[PDB]
Amino acid sequence: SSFSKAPQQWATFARVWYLLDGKMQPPGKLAAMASVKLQGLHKPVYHQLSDCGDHVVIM
């Protein structure tokens, strides 16, 4: 919690890489959660103007 300003900022707004196996999965149900992760709607620090968005890798 007692981080400096710049490392705290980096930790809070860091990008995350998620994996998603698409074997025998509906493309729509894959795409809904992939889009949620892409927008960043799973972050409490989310905002439309902020660039909070994580990478999604679908295999």
């Binding site: 709607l41 799973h42 409490p44 620090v45 905002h47």
Partner: protein, 140 residues
Amino acid sequence: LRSRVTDRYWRVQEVLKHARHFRGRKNRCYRLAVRAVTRAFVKCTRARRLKKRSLRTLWINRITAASQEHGLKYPAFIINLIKCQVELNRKVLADLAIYEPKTFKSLAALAKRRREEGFAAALGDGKEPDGIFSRVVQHR
């Protein structure tokens, strides 16, 4: 007695000061500025009305994000927090989610516990079993 307007400079400037940051000829020409300034003011009032709705939607989105991060859905979290007589609004809930992660996890655990007690009561249909967190406290 001929009367003419002598403060027209200030009359024009009172309108032109609100359009200095515009684009095109609307920041210079008075005819094109009066229409643009009026639209700016109308949009200002409408967006003042809509700012509360936009911020409430943002807070709700952040609460959904945090709750789903804790493995819980937003409607369930809200209704169980209400059933626990915890009257924290969406702004405070989003503030806690962003800045008080342990407190938000505790609130999510309490909401999930209340949901489990409600489900157990509904399944049992028994009056004598009462949940520990399902008790209602009246005004004192």
